[PDB]
């Protein structure tokens, strides 16, 4: 599938909010903790989002996460299109639940987690970082 | 030079603290504005990194940063070693003065001056962007 598509959500986990981007092609996740599940937070780590990837289009399971003049500002801004027509979201919990006793905070287990499911080879032998970093140069050469 | 080394470092505008990791080879940055300089945001802003990219070693300009148990244990948790042995930061700070109106926050702006540095192409014709993701996608196959 097209390398510029993303997945955007929030879960929660521990009454705190998680949100988590999924490059559609590759599987690779960023996911940050949030203090609030806002258009503001969401404009902002779209803003990092962009700055970072090539990131064209961009995919949610709530519609309505997507409807703030904040987050239209962020797409407008960095020039994002909605998507209008996995779950990482279990096995992102999953390893979470595993590493939940290496660290005090939540948001240092996500990390761990993001770090472990991206690096974790598929092999069939590519990780979902390797496979970004293949997808996108691939698609500039 | 190796794909693997990044540079650490913290510069601060309107009292705030900007923590601007550069990946050495490629001069594509990730910045993050922080509430203090402390070894605890830097532990946390160094695991994120590493879930990200392939960060086999990390340079800073100020070695006492690395000092603290907390960033230790990052480094020790994500495999990372320090280096010893641009300034993109007068760059990024030129970006940011340019951006600064069409944002309320610093934070925003950052990210804006972020987005912009990395797309920039240096025609002679790659962006920072592309070359990192080249280089690393370049050093798999
Ligand atoms: C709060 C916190 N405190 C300490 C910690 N620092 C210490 C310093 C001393 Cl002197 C003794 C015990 C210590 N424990 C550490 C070592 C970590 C840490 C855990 C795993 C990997 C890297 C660092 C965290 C961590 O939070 C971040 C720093 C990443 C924000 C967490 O959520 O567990
Ligand atoms: C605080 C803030 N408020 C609003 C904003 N939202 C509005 C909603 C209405 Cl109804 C009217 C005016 C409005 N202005 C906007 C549109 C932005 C924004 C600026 C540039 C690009 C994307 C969004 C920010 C922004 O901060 C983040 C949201 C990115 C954290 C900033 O620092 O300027």
Same mark, same amino acid.
């Given at each position: 599938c097209s390398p510029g598509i993303w997945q955007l959500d929030c879960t929660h986990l521990e009454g705190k909010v $998680? &949100?988590?981007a999924v490059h559609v092609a590759s599987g690779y996740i960023e996911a940050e903790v949030i203090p609030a599940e806002t258009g503001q937070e969401? +404009?902002?780590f779209l803003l990092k989002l962009a700055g970072?990837?090539?990131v064209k289009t961009v /995919?949610?399971?709530n519609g309505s996460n997507f409807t703030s003049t904040?987050?239209?500002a962020a797409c407008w801004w960095a020039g994002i299109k909605q998507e209008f027509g996995e779950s990482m979201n279990k096995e992102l919990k999953k390893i979470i639940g595993q590493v939940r006793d290496? +660290?005090? /905070? &939540?948001?240092?287990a996500v990390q761990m987690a993001v770090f472990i499911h991206?690096?974790?080879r598929k092999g069939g032998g590519y990780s979902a970082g390797e496979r970004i970093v293949d $997808? $996108? +140069?691939t698609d500039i050469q």
């Open positions: $998680i &949100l988590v969401t +404009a902002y970072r990837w090539p /995919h949610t399971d904040t987050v239209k290496q +660290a005090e /905070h &939540l948001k240092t991206n690096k974790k $997808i $996108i +140069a």
